[PDB]
Amino acid sequence: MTTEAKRAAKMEKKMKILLGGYQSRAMGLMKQLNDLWDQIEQAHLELRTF
Amino acid sequence: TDIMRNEFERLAARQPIELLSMKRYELPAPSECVNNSMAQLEHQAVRIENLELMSQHGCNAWKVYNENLVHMIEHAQKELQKLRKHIQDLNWQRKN
Amino acid sequence: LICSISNEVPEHPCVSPVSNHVYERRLIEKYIAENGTDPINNQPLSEEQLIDIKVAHPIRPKPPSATSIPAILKALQDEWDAVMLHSFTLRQQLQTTRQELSHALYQHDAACRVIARLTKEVTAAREALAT
Amino acid sequence: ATSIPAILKALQDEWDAVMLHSFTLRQQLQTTRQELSHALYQHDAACRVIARLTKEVTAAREALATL
Amino acid sequence: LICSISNEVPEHPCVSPVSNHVYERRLIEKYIAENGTDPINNQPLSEEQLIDIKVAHPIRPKPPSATSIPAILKALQDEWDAVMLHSFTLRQQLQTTRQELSHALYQHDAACRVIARLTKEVTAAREALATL
Amino acid sequence: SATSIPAILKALQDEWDAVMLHSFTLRQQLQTTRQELSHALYQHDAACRVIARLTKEVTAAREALAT
Numbered sequence: 001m002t003t004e005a006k007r008a009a010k011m012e013k014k015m016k017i018l019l020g021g022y023q024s025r026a027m028g029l030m031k032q033l034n035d036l037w038d039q040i041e042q043a044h045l046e047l048r049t050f
Numbered sequence: 051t052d053i054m055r056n057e058f059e060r061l062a063a064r065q066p067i068e069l070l071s072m073k074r075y076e077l078p079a080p081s082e083c084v085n086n087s088m089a090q091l092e093h094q095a096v097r098i099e100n101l102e103l104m105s106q107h108g109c110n111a112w113k114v115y116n117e118n119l120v121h122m123i124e125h126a127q128k129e130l131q132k133l134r135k136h137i138q139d140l141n142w143q144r145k146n
Numbered sequence: 147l148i149c150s151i152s153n154e155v156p157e158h159p160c161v162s163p164v165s166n167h168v169y170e171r172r173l174i175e176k177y178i179a180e181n182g183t184d185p186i187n188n189q190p191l192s193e194e195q196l197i198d199i200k201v202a203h204p205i206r207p208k209p210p211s212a213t214s215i216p217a218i219l220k221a222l223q224d225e226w227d228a229v230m231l232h233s234f235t236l237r238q239q240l241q242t243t244r245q246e247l248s249h250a251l252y253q254h255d256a257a258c259r260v261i262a263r264l265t266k267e268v269t270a271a272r273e274a275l276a277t
Numbered sequence: 278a279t280s281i282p283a284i285l286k287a288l289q290d291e292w293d294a295v296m297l298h299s300f301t302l303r304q305q306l307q308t309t310r311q312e313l314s315h316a317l318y319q320h321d322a323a324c325r326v327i328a329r330l331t332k333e334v335t336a337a338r339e340a341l342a343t344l
Numbered sequence: 345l346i347c348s349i350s351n352e353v354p355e356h357p358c359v360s361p362v363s364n365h366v367y368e369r370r371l372i373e374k375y376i377a378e379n380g381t382d383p384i385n386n387q388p389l390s391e392e393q394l395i396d397i398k399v400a401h402p403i404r405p406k407p408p409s410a411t412s413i414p415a416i417l418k419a420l421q422d423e424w425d426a427v428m429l430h431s432f433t434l435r436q437q438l439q440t441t442r443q444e445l446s447h448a449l450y451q452h453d454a455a456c457r458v459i460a461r462l463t464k465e466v467t468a469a470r471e472a473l474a475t476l
Numbered sequence: 477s478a479t480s481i482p483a484i485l486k487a488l489q490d491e492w493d494a495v496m497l498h499s500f501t502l503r504q505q506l507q508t509t510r511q512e513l514s515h516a517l518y519q520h521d522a523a524c525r526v527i528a529r530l531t532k533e534v535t536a537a538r539e540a541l542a543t
Contacts, residue, residue, distance in 0.1 A: 004094030008213075011101035015108050016210030022112045023207055029119035030407025036126035037148065040399035043133030045307065049314050050140040051180070052298060055291025058481025063230040069482025071219045072489030088500025089493070096427060097213055103426075104208045115205035119407050121345040122147035122155065125357065125397045150400035152296040155408035157418070163361045166395025176293040177300075185300055186401065199364025202345050204408045206415055214496075217419065218489060225413045226485075233299075240306060247313060254320040261327050268334030275341035281424075281491055288417065299403065307402035424495075431499060434506050441506070445513045452520055459523060462530040469537030 149173060151185060160198045164189040168199065347371060349383055357397045362387040369396070 062068065075093075078086060149156045149170040156170035165187040175193060177185050184191040347354040347368040354368030363385035367375075372394060375383050382389040408415060 001090050001094045004091070004098040008094065008097040008101045011098065011105045012210045012212075015101070015105045015112075019108045019112045019207050019210050022108075022116060023209065025113070025116050026119060026207060026407065026409070029116055029123060030409060033119065033123045033126065033147075034404055034406045036123060036130065037153075037399050037404045040126055040129050040133070041307065041402045041404070043130055043137070044399075044401075045310060045314060047133050047137050048311055049318065050137045052294030053291060054478065055294055055481075056298075058484075059230070059295070062226070062481060063234040066231075066234075067482070068223055068227050068230065069480075069485035071223050071485055072493055073219065074489075074493065075215045076219075085497040085501065088504060089496040090500075092496055092500040092503065093214055096423070096430075099426070100212075100423070104210075104212065107205075108207050108210070111205040112207050115207055115408065118202065118204055118345055121353075122407070125147055126399050128356075129399050147397060148400045148405040151300045151403070152414075153299075153400065153403040153405035154412075154414060155405065157414075159364075161359060161361055161364055161395075166359070166361055167398070167400070168359070172289070172293060173296045173300075176297050180297060185304075197361055197364050199359060199366075201366060206408050206410050206412075208410050208419070212410070214423065214492070217416065218492060221411065221416060222485075225411065225416060229295075229413065236302075240302070243306070243309060243313065247309070250313060250316050250320065254316060254323070257320065257324050257327060261323065261330060264327060264330045264334055268330050268337060271334050271337030271341065273337075275337055275344060277341075281495065284488060284491070285417070285421065292414070292417075303401075303403045427495075427499060431502070434503050438506050438509065441510045441513055445509065445516065448513065448516050448520060452516060452523075455520070455523060455527075459527060459530070462527060462534065466530050466533040466537060469534055469541065473537055473540050 151177070155204055157204065158198065159201065160196045162191055162196055164191055164195070171196075171198070349375065358394045359397060360389055361393050361395060362389045366397070367394075369394075 075090075078090075148154065148168075149159070150167045151169055151173040154170050154173075156168065158171045159168045160171045160174060161168050162174070162184055165184050167186055169185075174185075174196065178191060178193050182192055183189060345353065346366075347357075348365050349367060349371050352368065354366065354371070356369040357366045358369040358372060359366050360372070360382050363382045365384055367383070372383070373391060375381070376389060376391050376394070380388055380390055406412070410416065410419070
């Protein structure tokens with residue numbers, strides 16, 4: 001628990017510093033994709049309307 | 051049209067109550083605990099192993115997902131345009 | 147890039163040859179066994195008819211602050227909360243669409259009767275000017 | 278029965294239905310919205326027929342009345 | 345993300361329905377006009393057989409993340425499938441230690457009978473010789 | 477079983493909680509069986525040094541008996 005979790009916290013905080021930035025980067029992209037998928041349907045719906 | 055899964059899922063949503071998970075590992079107490087201790091050591095080892103594995107995957111992959119997510123996004127907005135162009139044409143036709 | 151059933155980002159996408167649409171293998175395999183036809187186009191489709199596709203693989207960065215503990219407790223709890231409160235709210239949205247459908251068709255047919263009533267009114271008023 | 282690996286297999290099998298159900302529920306959701314949209318548009322379109330019709334009917338009255 | 349024929353980032357991806365692989369429309373179109381075939385598997389393919397990449401339909405998706413329920417379930421497979429190999433490292437190493445312990449305790453049990461006889465014989469030789 | 481689903485959450489919690497200790501208990505036993513094996517190897521090699529001095533006391537005795 002001491003040896004491993006100290007390594008884990010070091011591995012985590014080293015990853016977190018590099019990857020919390022890349023998480024934020026990823027999250028935004030995901031959100032954008034989701035939004036787009038939402039506009040896609042309204043345009044398909046309106047296409048089939050018109 | 052599903053098995054037991056649908057009965058407990060619809061009951062969980064109707065009642066507005068999520069099933070309780072293992073609220074045990076985080077708290078614990080010093081001075082049965084020989085087992086609980088040996089659980090923690092193995093879990094910590096796995097975390098280091100997983101952390102190395104996770105870091106190892108995150109360390110090079112950390113951004114690989116982002117590269118893929120940008121290819122996935124642009125494809126949707128190309129469709130948005132293709133739909134935009136048809137409908138506009140239709141409207142113009144009607145107007146004329 | 148997504149699956150056309152669940153709204154996933156598939157791990158093993160497979161395309162059907164009757165209707166060009168990518169599904170995640172597990173979800174399309176389940177549909178064919180339930181009723182052997184394509185979900186979107188309702189065309190005859192079997193498990194052998196499917197064609198697996200290849201891509202550069204999808205990567206998710208597991209959070210740095212992760213462990214068996216949050217993944218068992220906090221993350222899995224949020225996933226079955228988010229599934230529960232969404233579909234319940236989605237069932238609420240489907241119920242109102244059918245109610246707001248009935249207010250649409252009634253108000254429509256109400257307008258049809260006004261037009262039919264005014265079509266007899268106008269032309270006879272114009273006819274009276276002719277007479 | 279109370280092991281472990283098949284519990285995850287069972288968790289997959291019940292989810293497999295969850296996805297199949299959500300698909301058929303969404304199809305009817307959007308397919309009904311097309312009828313809703315086409316109706317509301319055509320309703321207010323057919324509503325403008327009346328506005329036009331009413332004013333012409335009205336013009337026929339004062340014309341004939343004053344004549 | 346890539347086109348398999350050229351190696352570029354394709355600006356108009358169209359997936360074929362004979363060899364499942366994302367090709368760039370302008371590149372694959374010329375490959376079909378050369379000969380009606382799929383470049384990878386050399387199976388027959390026409391331009392109508394090729395299909396552009398699309399938004400699924402009406403179900404909204406979200407990007408592939410650690411939260412997502414299916415990605416979380418495939419994660420717990422990795423956890424257990426790795427921990428199952430961790431058990432083999434200790435089951436296999438236990439079968440060497442107990443096998444060396446079995447031969448060690450047998451050599452101990454075969455030897456200590458000879459220590460008991462030499463402690464008898466060397467003291468018996470001292471008991472015999474000292475009396476004379 | 478028909479089993480309530482919120483309970484199946486706590487089962488999977490308990491089963492991972494159990495397997496974590498069933499993996500832990502099997503590793504500390506491997507370390508102590510190797511540790512107690514190493515204590516036997518010291519006694520094994522220490523005993524065969526003690527036989528060499530006991531053989532000398534027998535060899536010294538066989539010389540004195542001859543005289």
